């Protein structure tokens, strides 16, 4: 039925590929090529409605390109991923949201804030601080672990729900 282009963004090392490969292939990768950018496709039923998801896992370099902008424009929703043990990656969220706003030429873009690595005890970003950030953005916040699979489906499916809400 409906096709959704989902884009997974966030700093290096936060778990973007690990989340995406869990969702698609149902295993946890311990180290995956940090530069590679690929898309993945999956059909899922969400709220009784079949959804064909096309998921772009971002990586590459810390640089502007017209080519990356082109692909980011195709996205209909974005996962803003940080790691709960990496404060810099949380500080970086703001940058990704701003660059999304730029390429979509919209401040109302479907997004979900994802705090990954929830299985690690050594947390440095409090749930409250991330919840307050998500509240300021008007988006959901979901804690995940690509390692245990806690919240992985929920994060992607909540982003599809956000895209559906926005399209109406
Ligand atoms: C370790 C490799 C990795 O995961 N990344 C490389 C650095 N990336 C990155 N660095 C800075 N800026 C961005 C900006 C974007 C972006 C551009 C336009 C719209 C939306 C958007 F997120 C991206 Cl895709 C990656 C950047 C990515 C992480
Ligand atoms: N403990 C833990 N490690 C994770 C989790 N997600 C990713 N990692 C690890 O963190 C590192 C970076 O993951 P990766 O998916 O390559 O990050 P990316 O640069 O954002 O794509 C790898 O060692 C992964 O195994 C998680 O939820 N829990
Ligand atoms: Ca990656
Ligand atoms: Ca909103």
Curated annotation (Swiss-Prot):
Keyword terms, alphabetized: Acetylation, Cardiomyopathy, Cell membrane, Cytoplasm, Deafness, Disease variant, Ectodermal dysplasia, Glycoprotein, GTP-binding, Hydrolase, Intellectual disability, Isopeptide bond, Lipoprotein, Membrane, Methylation, Nucleotide-binding, Palmitate, Prenylation, Proto-oncogene, Ubl conjugation
Activity regulation, per record: Alternates between an inactive form bound to GDP and an active form bound to GTP. Activated by a guanine nucleotide-exchange factor (GEF) and inactivated by a GTPase-activating protein (GAP). Interaction with SOS1 promotes exchange of bound GDP to GTP.
Positions annotated to bind GTP: 10-18, 29-35, 59-60, 116-119
Class of this enzyme: hydrolase
Molecular functions per Gene Ontology: G protein activity; GDP binding; GMP binding; GTP binding; GTPase activity; identical protein binding; LRR domain binding; protein-containing complex binding
Consequence of changing residue 117 to N: In colorectal cancer samples; somatic mutation
Keyword Hydrolase: yes
EC number: 3.6.5.2
GO CC terms: cytoplasm; cytoplasmic side of plasma membrane; cytosol; endoplasmic reticulum membrane; focal adhesion; Golgi membrane; membrane; mitochondrial outer membrane
Motif Effector region per UniProt: ranges: 32-40
PROSITE patterns the UniProt entry points to: RAS (PS51421)
Consequence recorded when altering residue 19 to F: In OES; somatic mutation
Disease connection: Leukemia, acute myelogenous: A subtype of acute leukemia, a cancer of the white blood cells. AML is a malignant disease of bone marrow characterized by maturational arrest of hematopoietic precursors at an early stage of development. Clonal expansion of myeloid blasts occurs in bone marrow, blood, and other tissue. Myelogenous leukemias develop from changes in cells that normally produce neutrophils, basophils, eosinophils and monocytes.
Official protein name in the record: GTPase KRas
Organism: Homo sapiens
Upper classification of the organism: Eukaryota, Metazoa, Chordata, Craniata, Vertebrata
């Amino acid at each position: 039925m409906t096709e959704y282009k989902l884009v997974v963004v966030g700093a290096c090392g936060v778990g973007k590929s690990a989340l995406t490969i869990q969702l698609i292939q149902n295993h946890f990768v311990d180290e995956y090529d940090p530069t590679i950018e690929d898309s993945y496709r999956k059909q899922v039923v969400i709220d009784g409605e079949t959804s064909l998801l096309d998921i772009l896992d971002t990586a590459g370099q810390e640089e502007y390109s017209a080519m990356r902008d082109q692909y980011m424009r195709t996205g209909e929703g974005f996962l803003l991923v940080f790691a709960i043990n990496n404060t810099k990656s949380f500080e970086d969220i703001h940058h990704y949201r701003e660059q999304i706003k730029r390429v979509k030429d919209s401040e109302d873009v479907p997004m979900v804030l994802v705090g990954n690595k929830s299985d690690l005890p050594s947390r440095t970003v409090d749930t409250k601080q991330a919840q307050d950030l998500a509240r300021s953005y008007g988006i959901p916040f979901i804690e995940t672990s690509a390692k245990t699979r806690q919240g992985v489906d929920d994060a992607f499916y909540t982003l599809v729900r956000e895209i559906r809400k926005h399209k109406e």
